[PDB]
Amino acid sequence: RPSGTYAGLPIADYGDAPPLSTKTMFWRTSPEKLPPGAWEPAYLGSKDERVDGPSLQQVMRDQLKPYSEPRGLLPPQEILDAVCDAIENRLENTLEPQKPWTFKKACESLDKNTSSGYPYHKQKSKDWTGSAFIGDLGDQATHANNMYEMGKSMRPIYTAALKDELVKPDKIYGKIKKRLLWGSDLGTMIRAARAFGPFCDALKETCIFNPIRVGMSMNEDGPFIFARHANFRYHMDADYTRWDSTQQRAILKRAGDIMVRLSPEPDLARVVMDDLLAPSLLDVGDYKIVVEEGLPSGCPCTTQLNSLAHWILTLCAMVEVTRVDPDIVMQESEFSFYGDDEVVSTNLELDMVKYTMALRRYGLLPTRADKEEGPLERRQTLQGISFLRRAIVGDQFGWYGRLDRASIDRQLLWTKGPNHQNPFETLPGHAQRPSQLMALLGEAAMHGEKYYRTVASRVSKEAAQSGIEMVVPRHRSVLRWVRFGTMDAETP
Amino acid sequence: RPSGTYAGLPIADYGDAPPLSTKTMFWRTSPEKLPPGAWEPAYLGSKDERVDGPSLQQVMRDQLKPYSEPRGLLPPQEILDAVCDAIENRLENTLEPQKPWTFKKACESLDKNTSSGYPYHKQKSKDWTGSAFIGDLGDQATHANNMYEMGKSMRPIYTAALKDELVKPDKIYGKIKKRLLWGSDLGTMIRAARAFGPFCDALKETCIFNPIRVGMSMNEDGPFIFARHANFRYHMDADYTRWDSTQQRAILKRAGDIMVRLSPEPDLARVVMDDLLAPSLLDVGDYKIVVEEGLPSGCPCTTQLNSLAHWILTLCAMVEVTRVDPDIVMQESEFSFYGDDEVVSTNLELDMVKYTMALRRYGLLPTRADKEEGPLERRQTLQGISFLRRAIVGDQFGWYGRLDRASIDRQLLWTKGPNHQNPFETLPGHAQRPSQLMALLGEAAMHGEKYYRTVASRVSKEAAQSGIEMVVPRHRSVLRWVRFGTMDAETP
Ligand SMILES: [Mn+3]
Ligand SMILES: [Mn+3]
């Protein structure tokens, strides 16, 4: 060890991962022919009756290419230092200090409905008493917790997967594409959660005052978040391609440094962060390969780290171009980050050619709305920019996030259910989606009378040829409940 | 009846009111000489050892003068109709429909620590079981509730008082002035609360989305409210003199019409509103006088009615001058109203001479910051405008309301306690003001290190020569707790 090459990367060891999933969670809501150009669940492999394409394995090899691509340049050192200082300083000024997380708390915080990853590849709930891990997962948890408390290092092992999600038809029938997922190992999950849960909680409570929006409620917080952004003259979205795979570990380490420094157990958190950022072992089935660069997006606290790296790079490009100090940029701007997702608003008069070039030089791949070459565009209205998959809309009552007509139509055409081979199958279960149907009514209401009425029809049929019968409210009642609703819970 | 004149108004009947209060609730926090030009509790009458002035009765007569002053002009009818429609329409779009208030609920909502007014003039708690009124107050409550349910009219009777509050020294030592209070009668309080409590609750839940800010939290809501205002180019405050006494009942009736129309029991609410707005009987001690014009500010739901009248008049003046429809003005503006208190923000290019003239023509008395003649000023920054007795301040974290240095100094010089004759007396009770002292620390923190340190000294002494001993936190800890504090309750 380590010798040999897979998908352009060094092989470190034999693989333990289970075969890639061959099934989808999405079921058609009806037997009718799907409208043309309609989204469908992502490609399912050699058994996919819709097309003859490559193996899931090959598809995965295609996803791994960007990770052997040469890295971009580091932003100038003085700028990088200055923005990191300003960011850490802003977080010191805003974050409520936290108590350390117990092993019990770290264990509780983990999603019990996903895999434990290496080495047991077992749904976490299978070994979960309701308050602790027993059996195989108990051994793994307890050992990792011990390593944590002794400040001892452990090599993380990630398990590769491909995301089951609705994609545009060309990704199925033209050039096939399915998105890479990093499945973290339980040990790592426990260590990361104990180390960084305090930081991430402090950050969530602060997701309106600070640009990292993880843990926000779109309906509850969106109005205030977007009103903040609207206080500034210029608005933009760089719309990055392949964000995760274009990351530099060096940038990620500076992001990690801030997280460590701002944790209640910095010395123990350092050991964990150092493990997270070291050349990553990724299990692709037959092999474990070494992934030296890009984001290892497996963990609990991965989204925060990534959003922090994003904050760094955005401030770097802006400071480099405007020549204004990072702290002053921050008093002339409002940012929203959520992993690769962003809105940047500023009063600063930004040279968009120079800004785009700076981003490209860092190895990032920003893209124009029209998908043609040239500089990123800026506008003087927020209307038309999106965030967390919602369009930002403003009227006489304020700002808010609204799901577009295409996405509402999509959720009406598909429903989540158990895993199965054929997406076009109907879920014969009568299919009770009551809470979901309600939210969908809410989204449609925000589009007007005409649109709401058509969705209300489809929602009725879908509840008619189903179990329960619920009242379908008037437009003006549900509109009032989504926009201003005294709280979220239950109907208008 | 009705014959004879008191304070320029018709006498309707003999008075039943108790003598005007001769005492203040404020006690000096120390025996040291007060700084020169320092605020003091308002004038206490013939027994006030600080000055020889007129009787409280005469002072009251001076307060009653504006109510016999001729009224201003009604805004043009087409405009008035259009703004009322647009206002009622905005409230229909935003307010969650409510269930009627029970007698039990109306009774519970009443402040039990103030007077029952006519005819018993007894603190409400004196007859309060903890869930119902018994004794004299029970008779009064029950009868009024019966009149309410039968849609029967009752003549309200108000009791005049003078506000015990800190005033600038000239109002004590120069031309004496003490502010008029209308003390409503229990019967009226119950009827008004049953009739309009539903409307006022609907409005409170909506105090961020709608311009009537009653029920807002400055710390919790201020940031969002002020961020909304900042979305607009021009900002102003008309800073009205004698708002309540310059009101037209005709304007108040249109305000009342909206409240009625938007209540769950409109026919019963109409009887109550019609009683509220009819020529008012005001008990000044020796007489009950008829007050035909101005605001009868006695009730529970008086502040909402007044804020609504304010909304009407502000929209009227703006529409009259800009020539833009009331609904479009509202999509180009953000207002905040709380009785006479206002902030108006707009993208509309408003002729400030014409706007000031329109307001003056309605009988209002707006005033310039510099207190000289001429037009109201507008600015392009919110910074420097106040609301709910707080300055509006914005930094890199957002907007917020901050109490000024003079007001912080004031609350350090005086403390509330039982009623007594001499303001300069020290409250010998050791004087535990723990919650208050904390908030004051919070306000000072928002002024910087230097100022916070001086206040921290004074707050320590005041806790030292007192009962309890509490930790006095660092500047950066308390600043973090006031601005962003995970919640309000307890310390940083
Ligand atoms: Mn985006
Ligand atoms: Mn004011």
Swiss-Prot record, chains A, B:
Mutagenesis / variant outcome for changing D239A: Almost complete loss of RNA-directed RNA polymerase
Catalytic reactions on record: RNA(n) + a ribonucleoside 5'-triphosphate = RNA(n+1) + diphosphate
Cofactor: Mg(2+); Mn(2+)
Annotated positions binding Mg(2+): D237, D239, D341, E342, S386
Variant or mutagenesis effect after changing D341A: Almost complete loss of RNA-directed RNA polymerase
Compartments where found: Host cytoplasm, Host perinuclear region
RdRp catalytic domain: residues covered: 233-354
Activity modulation comment: Inhibited by Suramin, Suramin-related compounds and NF023. Inhibited by PPNDS.
Quaternary structure and partners: Homohexamer; also forms fibrous hexameric oligomer. Interacts with the viral genome-linked protein; this interaction induces the multimerization of the RdRp and enhances its activity.
Name of this protein: RNA-directed RNA polymerase
Part of the full-length chain shown: 1184 to 1675 of 1687
